[PDB]
Enzyme design. Structure first.
Site, PDB file in Angstrom:
ATOM      1  N   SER A 296       0.810  -1.228   0.086  1.00  0.00           N
ATOM      2  CA  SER A 296      -0.048   0.171   0.037  1.00  0.00           C
ATOM      3  C   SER A 296       0.892   1.185   0.059  1.00  0.00           C
ATOM      4  O   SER A 296       1.451   1.763  -1.191  1.00  0.00           O
ATOM      5  CB  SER A 296      -0.887  -0.062   1.283  1.00  0.00           C
ATOM      6  OG  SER A 296      -2.159   0.699   1.066  1.00  0.00           O
TER       7      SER A 296
ATOM      8  N   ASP B  95     -11.311  -5.252  -0.379  1.00  0.00           N
ATOM      9  CA  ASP B  95     -10.665  -4.500   0.325  1.00  0.00           C
ATOM     10  C   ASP B  95     -11.156  -3.137   0.910  1.00  0.00           C
ATOM     11  O   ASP B  95     -11.698  -2.543  -0.242  1.00  0.00           O
ATOM     12  CB  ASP B  95      -9.312  -4.285  -0.255  1.00  0.00           C
ATOM     13  CG  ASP B  95      -8.490  -3.265   0.525  1.00  0.00           C
ATOM     14  OD1 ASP B  95      -8.737  -2.865   1.760  1.00  0.00           O
ATOM     15  OD2 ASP B  95      -7.002  -3.316   0.232  1.00  0.00           O
TER      16      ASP B  95
ATOM     17  N   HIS C 257      -7.272  -5.552   3.621  1.00  0.00           N
ATOM     18  CA  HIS C 257      -6.220  -4.437   3.095  1.00  0.00           C
ATOM     19  C   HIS C 257      -4.738  -4.975   3.302  1.00  0.00           C
ATOM     20  O   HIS C 257      -4.113  -4.696   2.598  1.00  0.00           O
ATOM     21  CB  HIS C 257      -6.288  -3.319   3.759  1.00  0.00           C
ATOM     22  CG  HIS C 257      -5.445  -2.273   3.474  1.00  0.00           C
ATOM     23  ND1 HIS C 257      -5.486  -1.953   1.944  1.00  0.00           N
ATOM     24  CD2 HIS C 257      -4.488  -1.383   3.922  1.00  0.00           C
ATOM     25  CE1 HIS C 257      -4.643  -0.914   1.861  1.00  0.00           C
ATOM     26  NE2 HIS C 257      -4.010  -0.646   2.807  1.00  0.00           N
TER      27      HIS C 257
END
Lengths: 266, 275
Positions: free
Chosen positions: B102, B224, B253
């Site tokens: 991320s 997610d 996530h």
């Protein structure tokens, strides 16, 4: 026409003309927030120097703008085309130094120069500290053509002292990449290869030196070097700003400083 | 150097840099928000035999010294990209395979803009360029959901973080994933953690996606709450260079931490096979 080629804009009214000159990577729209504070009291002439993305690449002469005087001569031609004399020239960096060189040739055309972040030379000697050792510059300047996008994106946050999401950074990058890249590399090389020290003693027009307190292109010592070496009167004001373009990145501080130096004579 | 603050000694020490394996290529592992390099415990044994592996903690993680956290620097994501550039240069790494989760994957994307010489591909787990929806881009969060959730952040980092952890992870309350994410997440100093949270929620990198040119492998969960699948699929059409998207049958996530059995084989294929 000279006015066409440089997108000349004239606003306001006043006995005196203030002439606004943007630096590398921008165009005249960089002065959007200074201009409303000038129009009630002065005529304001704005123009784009040759090679900016707003201008026609086919008027860019690589031989002419490999030297800063090429811009000085353009400036003289523009001031003459519009019957301006003893103007207040406000310029950022290269444009302020080009107007100083223009004032050597025709001092009748400038009453004062207002120089935001000026430097006469970037590369150090044993004598003079401009902020850059010669072989760092030689490594960037010979790689620059391969480099240009990656190098600009990488150094822009440090140059502007802005974050990547900032409006100032997005707008600087937008105009910066509207230049044709070969043209942009020519101007860069010219800017980095500058050594205007032999000519400072021949500038006689009054000079207001406005600097950022934290500018990676302009050590704070350069402002005082200019003041002690200029041939005429000068004053130095170091602002509590960061970044090489404080008029774009911190107008709230910079604009009142610029205004006071426009309006008050040494 | 300010008196009472621990002196910073070295880029490697400061980021707890760990180098493992042997290999002609270096794989660099970058943990996301709320964790540290131990989040890769289960992936690393499958890499050391074929690659060099560099692990590091980004600044502000509970593993790092709070006296090195600069609030102006990590208020914007580039602060991490420059740290990444500095680490890779301190350890003589070039054309690496960057695997990031991320936030860290997006910081590497920006670093690859600045210095493409240092990355051969990016492997991005659940990346997103912007969380807050616009007119009209769907990032998964209405603006005042974020605005209320961000003004709640300082009000109580703990309750908001524990409260949303199950939805973020898509894991059970007794799960190892929940215990371990919460443990490292609560080892951040709360002022530091709030700074990073704000930076992440206020990020918008879409104006720069067109300048990314290194190959990007986009790996995300099909469910997610931070990354609608449309975002990975948005990144694909807007990145400047070659890209590939694999939507895994995972939830959460951080599927590498909560569903390693699905995620680890996917990450391995993208590391080892080029577009």
């Amino acid at each position: 026409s000279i006015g066409l080629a440089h997108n000349v804009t004239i606003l306001g009214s006043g006995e005196t003309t203030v002439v606004l000159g943007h630096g590398y990577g921008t165009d005249q729209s960089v002065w959007k927030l200074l201009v409303p504070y000038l129009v009630d009291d002065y005529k304001v002439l704005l123009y784009d120097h040759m090679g900016a993305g707003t201008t026609n690449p086919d008027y860019f002469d690589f031989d002419r703008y490999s030297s800063l005087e090429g811009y000085s001569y353009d400036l003289i031609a523009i001031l003459e085309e519009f019957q301006v004399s003893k103007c207040i020239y406000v310029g950022h960096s290269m444009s302020s130094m080009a107007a100083a060189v223009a004032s050597i040739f025709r001092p009748d055309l400038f009453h004062k120069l207002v120089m935001i972040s000026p430097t006469p030379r970037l590369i150090n000697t044993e004598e003079y500290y401009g902020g850059f050792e010669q072989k760092v510059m030689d490594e960037t300047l010979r790689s620059l053509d391969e480099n240009f996008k990656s190098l600009s994106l990488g150094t822009a946050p440090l140059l502007l002292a802005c974050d990547l999401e900032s409006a100032a950074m997005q707008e600087y990058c937008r105009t910066l990449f509207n230049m044709r890249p070969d043209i942009a590399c020519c101007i860069t090389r010219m800017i980095c290869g500058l050594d205007l020290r032999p000519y400072l003693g021949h500038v006689t027009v009054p000079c207001h030196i406005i600097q950022s307190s934290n500018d990676i292109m302009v050590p704070v010592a350069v402002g005082e070097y200019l003041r002690k070496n200029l041939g005429g009167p000068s004053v130095v004001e170091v602002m509590p700003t960061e970044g090489h373009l404080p008029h774009l990145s911190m107008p709230e501080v910079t604009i009142p400083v610029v205004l006071r130096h426009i309006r008050q004579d040494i």
